[PDB]
Each structure stands twice: as structure tokens, then as C-alpha cells.
Design an enzyme around this catalytic site. Structure first.
Site, PDB file in Angstrom:
ATOM      1  N   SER A   1      -2.042  -4.185   2.224  1.00 33.49           N
ATOM      2  CA  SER A   1      -1.364  -3.819   1.003  1.00 33.49           C
ATOM      3  C   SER A   1      -1.209  -5.061   0.136  1.00 33.49           C
ATOM      4  CB  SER A   1      -0.087  -3.060   1.317  1.00 33.49           C
ATOM      5  OG  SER A   1       0.487  -2.523   0.124  1.00 33.49           O
TER       6      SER A   1
ATOM      7  N   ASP B   1      -6.365   6.581  -1.002  1.00 34.28           N
ATOM      8  CA  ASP B   1      -5.213   5.707  -1.199  1.00 34.28           C
ATOM      9  C   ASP B   1      -4.567   5.977  -2.556  1.00 34.28           C
ATOM     10  OD1 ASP B   1      -3.392   3.567  -1.455  1.00 34.28           O
ATOM     11  OD2 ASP B   1      -4.711   2.170  -0.364  1.00 34.28           O
TER      12      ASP B   1
ATOM     13  N   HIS C   1      -3.003   5.065   2.197  1.00 38.56           N
ATOM     14  CA  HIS C   1      -2.577   3.663   2.164  1.00 38.56           C
ATOM     15  C   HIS C   1      -2.080   3.161   3.522  1.00 38.56           C
ATOM     16  CE1 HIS C   1      -1.732  -0.049   0.006  1.00 38.56           C
ATOM     17  NE2 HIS C   1      -0.479  -0.038   0.416  1.00 38.56           N
TER      18      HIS C   1
END
Length: 259
Positions: free
Chosen positions: A131, A177, A209
Site C-alpha cells: 500500500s 483494487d 487491495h
């Protein structure tokens, strides 16, 4: 081997999918002072000293910042023959640049540690992260020449231009995502890694994600292969990177590119 940095058995597809590779893993906690957001974490490393020093891989945690989000990577990657540092942090440090700061600190912490320092070849460093931690991996790679490999996982970063990275970089996106869409994050990063020793994009079919926060055979096997190849110069792992996985329901891969 001609190559002094080769560690562990000749690989197979089955091998790189294993929850644990050849090396038994030890661990050592990290406790440090400061205001960079990295006050604790874990170092995982092969117990065995018989085979020589290893490269060191620092991992920035995921979207929600706790070490627990990346913990499964630590012993798993270390067991293939790496020192692996998992960073714990919090939401005050969500900027990729803040995560990059921590990655440098984590690499340096392991290098300077009385137990783990002697097991590291300081010339052979690497970064990963989830991330914004994946965005921070790209930034750390741009900043530290000793980083030989980067593996950003579903990376988030408003900075799109990665011409400054020389390290071989494998970007792992997630097809669905909704936090860091591949169309605006992962793939632009792949496209701008124009100076990376090698660049690869590997998209996880029908994942979003948070896929990197759970044990993931695809992430693990290609992370192992990439780190082996670029941290260890281990040509035995090229066979898995090129041609790489084909796309579709049977591989769980929706896109794979090399450049």
C-alpha cells in the site's frame, strides 16, 4: 557455484510455493527510539551460518500500518535465505515518503545489530511494502543505491515517475483494487520504471487491495524468485520470471509483464 551468493537448493515451482523454504528461521525483536514511526518490529533470518551471509529485505507494513499486516512475509521469505525486517508503524506515518524513511532505518537497524548484522551482506539490500508502504519501497529504492530489488505490493503513491529507480522492481497489483487502482498506481509505476535493471508487473486476478495481508502463494513465489534473482544474482530463478505465469482463472494471474 561461480556465483558466491547462491543459497539453498536448486528451485522448482513446488519449492517456491512452499510456506517455508530450506532454511530454519530464527527471529529477534527490534526496539528503538525516535519519531520516525518505527519504534518496533521483527528481524527474521536463517539460523544456519554454514552457507555464508544473506541479503537483507525490509518490509513496510500495509494500509492500516501494523506489522501484523505483513508478518506472514517475514519467516516465509527468510526461510528461502534472507534477513527480513518487518516494520510496525501507525497512521501518523501514512505518506510514502515517511514509509521510505522507516525502510532505510530498518535496513540500517539490522545491519548494525550485534546478532543479525554479521549475517548480512550490506551490498545486497532490498525493500518491499504494502500500500503506501509499497509506494515507500519505490521511494527508498530511488534513494539507496544498495537496494538491488524492490517488490511493492498493491502500491499507493501520488508520485508516478520512477525513472530514478535502478533496482530491479516487481510491482504486484490487485485487479480489483479500489484503494490504489492499478490503472492509476501500479501500472503507471511499472511504465515509469524505465531505468530499473528489470521491471515486472504481476496482477492478482480478482483480488483487491488487502490480498497482500494474508498468506498468498502468488505473492510469495514471485517475491522469492525476484529477491533471489536480484538480491543474490541467482540465475536459477530466472526460469520463473521469464516467461512468467500465463494469465487466467487457472494461474490466478490477470496480467503479467516484463520490461
Amino acid at each position: 557455484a561461480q556465483n558466491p551468493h547462491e543459497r539453498g537448493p536448486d528451485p522448482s515451482n513446488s519449492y517456491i510455493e512452499q510456506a517455508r523454504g530450506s532454511y530454519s528461521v530464527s527471529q529477534r525483536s527490534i526496539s528503538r527510539l525516535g519519531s520516525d514511526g518505527f519504534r518496533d518490529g521483527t528481524m527474521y533470518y536463517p539460523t544456519s551460518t554454514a552457507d555464508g551471509r544473506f541479503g537483507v529485505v525490509a518490509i513496510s507494513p500495509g494500509y492500516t500500518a501494523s506489522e501484523s499486516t505483513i508478518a506472514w512475509l517475514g519467516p516465509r521469505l527468510a526461510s528461502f535465505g534472507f534477513v527480513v525486517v518487518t516494520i510496525n508503524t501507525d497512521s501518523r506515518y501514512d505518506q510514502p515518503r515517511q514509509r521510505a524513511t522507516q525502510l532505510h532505518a530498518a535496513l540500517d537497524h539490522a545491519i548494525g545489530d550485534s546478532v543479525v548484522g554479521p549475517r548480512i551482506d550490506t551490498s545486497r539490500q532490498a525493500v518491499m511494502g504494502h500500500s503506501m508502504g509499497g509506494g515507500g519501497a519505490l521511494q527508498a529504492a530511488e534513494e539507496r543505491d544498495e537496494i538491488r530489488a524492490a517488490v511493492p505490493l498493491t502500491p499507493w503513491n501520488l508520485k508516478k515517475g520512477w525513472s530514478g529507480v535502478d533496482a530491479a522492481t516487481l510491482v504486484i497489483g490487485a485487479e480489483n483494487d479500489a484503494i490504489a487502482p492499478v490503472r492509476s498506481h501500479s501500472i503507471p509505476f511499472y511504465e515509469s520504471l524505465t531505468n530499473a535493471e528489470r521491471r515486472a508487473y504481476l496482477e492478482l486476478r480478482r483480488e483487491g487491495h488487502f490480498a497482500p495481508n494474508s498468506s498468498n502463494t502468488l505473492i510469495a513465489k514471485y517475491s522469492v524468485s525476484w529477491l533471489k534473482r536480484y538480491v543474490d544474482n541467482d540465475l536459477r530463478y530466472d526460469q520463473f520470471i521469464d516467461p512468467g505465469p500465463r494469465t487466467g482463472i487457472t494461474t490466478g494471474v490477470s496480467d503479467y509483464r516484463l520490461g
